[PDB]
């Protein structure tokens, strides 16, 4: 089977959440592929299916639990399994579709949504932008419940909001220690609050950065990447040097050229 990472919200602390995200990261990459100090995720083309996913099992304030499946090539969530059923976002190509059929194989019920995991559809399904969807311990606990009772009937809107919560707190937290940081702070000071423009813009640009960083001149971007501060103030990124404490993982965009010695 696939590697499994566990985490409970009930007694979750800053140490528990940090241990959780630090372990998820360690499963996503060897890695053993590092460029400008940032680890790269394995290349999708030719990834053997036995190495293609990781499993994240989430426990509620009640014992009820849900197991999430994350695509190793981009750390994104591809679907989940409530105990008796398995749900999957609509893949965008055949090879992807084939790959998920190796997930939760012993389950009895097997569904594939008529939509993908991209934030736009999830936002229209939830009725709210992630800008307007609180995150933190409370929201995650609350989310991982509606993900169980969906197989038993909690309509789509409330379900979509739960994905939005989980993806940011897990998929994005692994991608960005900055996003991991903000989650860690919401737990330390025990607050629930939506993400600010720095988190949202970081999410939107994780692929744009992965291209820039891997296609940079010794870390110099061929063109600047626009981001936003916590106050919504825009600013341009010209160099890998400043993202090193911000981003933790990149999607493989190309082979690593020979190093420029001397």
């Amino acid at each position, epitope marked *: 089977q696939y590697p499994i990472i566990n985490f409970t919200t009930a007694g979750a602390t800053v140490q528990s959440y940090t241990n959780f995200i630090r372990a998820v990261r360690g499963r996503l990459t060897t890695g053993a592929d590092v460029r400008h100090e940032i680890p790269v995720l394995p290349n999708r083309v030719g990834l053997p299916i036995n190495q293609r996913f990781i499993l994240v099992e989430l426990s509620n304030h009640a014992e009820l639990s849900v197991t999430l499946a994350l695509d190793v090539t981009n750390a994104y969530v591809v679907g989940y399994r409530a105990g008796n059923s398995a749900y999957f976002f609509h*893949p*965008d190509n055949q090879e992807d579709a084939e790959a998920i059929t190796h997930l939760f194989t012993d389950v*009895q*019920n*097997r569904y594939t*949504f*008529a939509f993908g995991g991209n934030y736009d559809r999830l936002e229209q399904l939830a009725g709210n932008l992630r800008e307007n969807i609180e995150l933190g311990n409370g929201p995650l606990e609350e989310a991982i419940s509606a993900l169980y009772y969906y197989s038993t009937g909690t309509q789509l809107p409330t379900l979509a909001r739960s994905f939005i919560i989980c993806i940011q707190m897990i998929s994005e937290a692994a991608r960005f220690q900055y996003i991991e940081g903000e989650m860690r702070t919401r737990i330390r000071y025990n607050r629930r609050s939506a993400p600010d423009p720095s988190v949202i813009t970081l999410e939107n640009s994780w692929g744009r950065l992965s291209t820039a960083i891997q296609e940079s001149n010794q870390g110099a971007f061929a063109s600047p990447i626009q981001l936003q501060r916590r106050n919504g103030s825009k600013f341009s990124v010209y160099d890998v040097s400043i993202l090193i404490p911000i981003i933790a993982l990149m999607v493989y965009r190309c082979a690593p050229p020979p190093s420029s010695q001397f």
Partner: nanobody
Amino acid sequence: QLAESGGGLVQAGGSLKLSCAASGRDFSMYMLAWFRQAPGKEREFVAAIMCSGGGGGTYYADSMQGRFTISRDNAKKTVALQMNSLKPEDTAVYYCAASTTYCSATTYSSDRLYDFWGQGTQVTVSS
């Protein structure tokens, strides 16, 4: 909004064809199915087709399998039901069903999974 057309009248053992034309960009991601009600019987699952990204497998009920065939034209946003060697049992009103929530499901046969329904069209088989 499912627009169903093409019933008809046929001497037993012949052929007809029903078509359903949808209007929606995400049409390619829909689980699609046909249901029929024969008078005296309740509404009955007939056939289903999975979205391309959901395997795309086609499924039929045993009493209709072989004789019938379901297909979609994603470019034309149309579904088809080609019926061959029609028995008089096959005289019924037929419906299209589309799942906007679902691409593929082990429980496809359930009418509960489908959100949109074409207007029933009459198939008559004489002998």
